Each structure stands twice: as C-alpha cells, then as structure tokens.
Amino acid sequence: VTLKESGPGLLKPSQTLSLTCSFSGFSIRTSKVGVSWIRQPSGKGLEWLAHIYWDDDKRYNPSLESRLTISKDTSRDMVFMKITSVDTADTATYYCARRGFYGRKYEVNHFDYWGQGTTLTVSSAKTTAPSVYPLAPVCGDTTGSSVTLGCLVKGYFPEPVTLTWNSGSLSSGVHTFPAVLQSDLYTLSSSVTVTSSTWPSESITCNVAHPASSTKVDKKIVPR
Amino acid sequence: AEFRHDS
Amino acid sequence: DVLMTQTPLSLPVNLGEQASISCRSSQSIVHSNGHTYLEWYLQRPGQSPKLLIYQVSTRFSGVPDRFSGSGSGTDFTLRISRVEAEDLGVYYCFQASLVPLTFGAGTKLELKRADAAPTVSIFPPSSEQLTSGGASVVCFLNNFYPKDINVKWKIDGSERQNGVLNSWTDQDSKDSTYSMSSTLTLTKDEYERHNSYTCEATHKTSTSPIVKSFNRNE
Numbered sequence: 001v002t003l004k005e006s007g008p009g010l011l012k013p014s015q016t017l018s019l020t021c022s023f024s025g026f027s028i029r030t031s032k033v034g035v036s037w038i039r040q041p042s043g044k045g046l047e048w049l050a051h052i053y054w055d056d057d058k059r060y061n062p063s064l065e066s067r068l069t070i071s072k073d074t075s076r077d078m079v080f081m082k083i084t085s086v087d088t089a090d091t092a093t094y095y096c097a098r099r100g101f102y103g104r105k106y107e108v109n110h111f112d113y114w115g116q117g118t119t120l121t122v123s124s125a126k127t128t129a130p131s132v133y134p135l136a137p138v139c140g141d142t143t144g145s146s147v148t149l150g151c152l153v154k155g156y157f158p159e160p161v162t163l164t165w166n167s168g169s170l171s172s173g174v175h176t177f178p179a180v181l182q183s184d185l186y187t188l189s190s191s192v193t194v195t196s197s198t199w200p201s202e203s204i205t206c207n208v209a210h211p212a213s214s215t216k217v218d219k220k221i222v223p224r
Numbered sequence: 225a226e227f228r229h230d231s
Numbered sequence: 232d233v234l235m236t237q238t239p240l241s242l243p244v245n246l247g248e249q250a251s252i253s254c255r256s257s258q259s260i261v262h263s264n265g266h267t268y269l270e271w272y273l274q275r276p277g278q279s280p281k282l283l284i285y286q287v288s289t290r291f292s293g294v295p296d297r298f299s300g301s302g303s304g305t306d307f308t309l310r311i312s313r314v315e316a317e318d319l320g321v322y323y324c325f326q327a328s329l330v331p332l333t334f335g336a337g338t339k340l341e342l343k344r345a346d347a348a349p350t351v352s353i354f355p356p357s358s359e360q361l362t363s364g365g366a367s368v369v370c371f372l373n374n375f376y377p378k379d380i381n382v383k384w385k386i387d388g389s390e391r392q393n394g395v396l397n398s399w400t401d402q403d404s405k406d407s408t409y410s411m412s413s414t415l416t417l418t419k420d421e422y423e424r425h426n427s428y429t430c431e432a433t434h435k436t437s438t439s440p441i442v443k444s445f446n447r448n449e
Contacts, residue, residue, distance in 0.1 A: 032230075036332075038280075046272075046280065046323055048332040051227075059227060061331040062232070095279065106230040110270050110285040110327075117279060135354040135369055138445045148352040152360075152367055152414065175373055177398035177412040187396055189412045191352065191371040224355070225330045229264055 001025040005096045007118035010158055017083040017120065021096030028054070028074050034099035034109065035079045037070065039092040040117075042181065051099070052079060086122045091181060093117040123157060123184040129213035130156035134206065134221045135191075142223070147196055149221045151206030153188040162209045163190050170194075170204065233257055235324050237335035241378065243343035244314050252338045254307040254324035261304060261328070268327040271300055271309050274337075275320035276401060283322075284309065314340070344407040348436035349375035353429075353443040356422060366422030368415045370430030370443065374408040381433040384415045386425045391415060422447070 002024040011017060021035065028035075032054035040046050050070040051059045060068050069082040083090060100112035135150030153161055163176050176190040192204065200223045209216045234257040244250050254269070261267050271284040282291040284300035287307065297312040311318055321337040349372035356366040372380065378399075384391040394417060400410045413430065426448065432441040 045321070045337040046274075046325075046334045048325075048334065051332075053228065053230075057228065059330050063331065097280075107264060107266060108286065109229065110268075110282055110291070111272070111280075111325075112282055112291065114279045114281065131360070131363070133357040133360045133367070135357065137352065138355060138449055140445075140449070141352065141443075148350065148371060148373070150352075150354055150369060150371060152357075152369055154360075154365075154367065154416075175371070175400060175410045175412075177400060177410070180396055180398050182396050187414065189369060189371075189398065189414065191373060191410075191412070193350070193373070226263060227268070227327050227330050227332060229262065229266070229268075231264070 001098070001113050003096050003098060003113055003115035005094060005115045005118040007094060007120055009118075009120065011086050011120060011122050012124055013087045013122055015086055017081070017086050017090065019081040019083075019094055019096075019118065021079045021115065023077045023079075023098070028072070028077050028079075031100070032106070033101070035072070036097045036099060036111065037081045038095045038097055038111075038114075040095070041089065041092040050081060086120075088122050088181070088184075091120060091122050093119045121158060121181065123181065125157035125184045127212050128155060128157045128185060129215040130154060130161060130208060130210050130217075132206065132208045132217045132219050134219045136221050136224050138224060142196065145196055146193055147199055148191050148193045149199065149204055150189060150191045151208070151219060151221070153190075153208050155185045155187065156210050156213070157185050158212055159186055160211070161186075161188055163188065164207045165190070165192050166203075166205055167207055232331055233260060233326050233329050233333050235326060235333050235335040237322075237324060237338045240336060240338055242338055242340050243377070244340060245343050246316060247313055250311040250314050250318075250340060252309045252322055252324075252340075254302075254309070254335055256305045256307075256326055258329075259304050260326040267303065269300075269302070269307055270325045270327065272323045272325060273318070273320050274323070275317070278320075280323070311340075341402050342407045344376050346436050347374060347376040347408055349373060349380065349411075349432060349434060349441065351430060351432060351441055351443045353445060355428070355445055355447070361419050361422070364419050366417040366419050368417070368422075368428050370413045371410070372413070372432055373410040374403075374406070375410070375434060375436070376408050377435065378402075378409045379435070380411065382411065382413050383431045383433075384413070385427075385429040385431060387427050
C-alpha cells in the first residue's frame with residue numbers, strides 16, 4: 001500500500017489549489033476505505049481538512065469548509081481536494097491519509113497510511129535573486145578568543161538556496177538557519193564562529209547559490 | 225456532530 | 232468543537248528513561264456506536280506522521296510494546312517504558328468521534344541535556360545593504376539549552392516589536408543544543424535616525440538579561 005500526493009508546489013494568492021492523492025497496492029472500490037486530507041501549516045501542528053467516504057459522502061473542518069471541495073475517482077484510484085482563494089496561511093504540507101481498518105471491522109478505522117505529502121508555498125513573488133550581505137562584528141566585539149561572523153541572505157524566491165563557508169571547507173562552528181517566508185519573500189542567515197587568530201588574518205567567505213535565479217554570489221566577510 | 229463510522 | 236490539550240508540549244528525556252504524555256479532550260469523545268476514537272500519531276523529524284495507537288489502547292501493527300495507551304472519556308495517557316532514539320519526534324493525540332476531527336498541539340519528545348548559555352552576537356547593517364536603502368540588524372543566539380528563550384530588540388532603549396524575522400534550528404544532532412537568529416529590518420533612513428541597537432535575551436542560565444549592543448557611530 002502506497003499513497004502519493006501531487007500538487008503545484010507554488011501558487012499565487014487568490015488561486016485555487018488542486019491536490020491529487022493516488023493509491024497503489026489496493027483498490028479504493030474494494031476496500032471501501034475512507035480518505036482524509038490533513039495539512040501542517042508552516043511552524044504549526046497537524047490540522048484535519050476533509051474526508052470522503054466510499055459512497056462519496058463528505059465531511060469538512062468548519063474552520064476552512066467554505067473554501068474546500070473533496071472528491072474522488074474510484075476508477076482511477078484517486079482522491080482530490082480543491083481549496084479556493086489561497087493566501088499565505090495556506091503555505092503548508094498537505095497529506096493524504098487512508099482511514100483503513102483490518103477486515104471486516106469497518107468501525108475500527110484509523111489513519112493507517114499517510115503519504116509523503118506535497119508542500120505548497122503561497123506567494124505573489126516571481127523568481128527573485130537574494131541580496132547577500134556580509135555580517136562583520138563591531139570592532140569592540142573582536143577583542144576576545146573567538147569571533148562570530150555571519151551572512152544574511154535576504155529577499156529571495158522560491159526556495160532553496162545553498163549557503164556554504166569557504167566553498168564548504170569551513171563546517172565546524174556553523175549554524176545555518178531555516179529559511180522563513182515573510183512579505184512574500186524568503187530570508188535565511190548563517191553564523192560561523194572561529195578563533196580570533198583565524199579572522200581577519202585568514203579570509204572567510206559566504207558562498208550563496210540560488211538555482212531558481214541562476215545566481216551564485218561570494219561575499220567575503222571584511223572587518224569594519 | 226458525530227463523525228460517521230460504518231459497521 | 233473538541234479541544235485536545237496535551238501536557239507537556241515539550242518533554243525532554245534521557246534515552247532509556249520512561250516518558251508520559253497526557254491528553255485531555257474538552258468533552259467526552261465516546262462515540263454513540265460505543266467506541267472511543269482516540270488515536271496517537273508520531274511524526275519523527277523529517278518524516279510523515281505514523282499511527283501508533285488507536286481506540287485509546289490498541290497498538291498498530293509494527294509498533295513496539297514499550298508504547299502503551301490508556302484512559303477513558305476525556306482523560307488519556309501515552310506511556311513509553313524505555314525511550315529509544317527512534318521514538319524522538321512530535322506526538323499528537325487525535326479524536327475522530329466528532330466533527331471537526333481534531334489534533335492536539337503536539338508534544339515534542341526531545342533529548343535532555345545540561346543547561347547551556349547562548350553565545351550572543353550582534354551585527355550592524357552592512358555597507359552594501361545601506362547603499363541599497365535598507366538596514367537589517369542581526370542577532371545570533373547560539374548553542375543554548377533549554378529551548379525556551381525570550382529575545383527583545385531595543386533601539387535607543389525602546390522595545391522594537393515590528394520588522395522582526397526569527398528563525399530557530401532543530402535540536403542539534405550531536406550536542407543537543409538549540410540556536411536562534413533574529414533579524415530586525417529597518418529603512419536606511421530609520422537606522423540613521425537612531426544610535427544604540429540592543430539584542431536582549433532572557434534565558435534560565437543567567438539571573439540577569441543577556442545583552443549585546445552597538446552604537447551606529449562607533
């Protein structure tokens with residue numbers, strides 16, 4: 001038994017989301033399993049959206065129901081979800097979950113199989129290259145035994161970027177933070193901590209690639 | 225409202 | 232609708248110890264058909280949720296017997312007898328008796344370790360950003376434990392709540408600490424109006440505020 005969700009990946013606000021869940025390894029028709037859609041918004045837990053029974057009866061979460069339509073095509077072994085008028089808050093991973101049971105105990109049902117999910121980001125942005133900015137300390141903050149440097153990767157779309165330090169040779173003492181979507185664009189940052197004897201006497205460079213915009217930028221961290 | 229469970 | 236309240240929301244443990252997670256529903260989730268549709272799901276880091284327990288106390292096939300579910304009506308408990316590395320992740324209780332079906336907020340079962348103070352570092356805007364018309368100030372708070380931390384920006388002594396973008400790392404796989412990045416973004420003109428920039432943190436490892444500052448003119 002496998003479940004596979006498909007979705008557009010990116011939408012602009014106000015568009016309609018069309019999701020598909022495709023089942024393998026059993027028959028929706030024969031099994032009479034119910035199917036739900038469940039989502040996980042960015043930085044939140046799980047939320048149940050909608051469920052469809054074998055006979056096409058449906059149930060919805062009132063919080064979103066007015067925007068939701070669930071449907072199925074048994075002959076294709078597929079279940080569908082439409083969500084109208086998407087906006088930023090619909091940025092989430094969408095899971096298809098089978099409400100299976102061990103035969104023939106229809107009443108002892110539960111979400112036994114979940115797919116890998118399909119992620120959606122909702123943004124008005126077109127492809128946008130990041131601005132990459134070196135973060136050097138003020139002079140007072142370079143008097144100790146270590147120094148922390150950083151790199152700010154601001155205002156790009158879509159994900160991902162790849163950030164490395166000295167072309168990947170500098171890996172210890174690095175913290176690269178997950179990207180965050182805000183005002184329709186992503187921002188990411190990374191810090192690296194090295195000995196005071198290392199920098200600024202040796203060079204430290206942030207390397208940033210954003211494949212969607214075909215950009216690659218190296219920013220040397222230079223003392224103020 | 226109760227969720228439907230078949231038997 | 233049925234609120235599902237899990238306690239605690241964060242549960243640090245040592246591997247090999249017992250763990251206990253409580254789930255309270257706001258009303259009875261005994262269904263009219265006689266069953267109580269209380270389920271427990273585990274989402275391991277970077278994976279899909281998986282079923283652990285159904286009908287309050289029945290383990291799903293493949294789930295080890297160190298897991299046990301108990302309770303009745305509104306009062307439910309998940310116990311793990313001896314926590315293993317594959318058990319770490321977020322645990323959700325879930326009721327499927329009433330519509331909307333509802334999850335708890337999730338309980339993160341995480342590795343315990345000794346407290347550690349953040350290494351805090353603050354960064355003025357880069358020359359490059361300033362020339363473009365913007366001004367971001369960045370504060371890193373690195374390698375701290377526990378995860379609970381309050382970060383405040385102050386500009387000329389006044390708290391700045393707006394224009395902030397925060398990001399957090401997941402618990403470190405080797406040293407089990409957390410790190411945070413906070414970016415306060417202004418216009419160049421706003422940045423040039425003000426003098427002192429401060430990143431202030433409250434964490435249990437210090438009896439006083441953890442402060443890093445700079446003056447724009449220095």
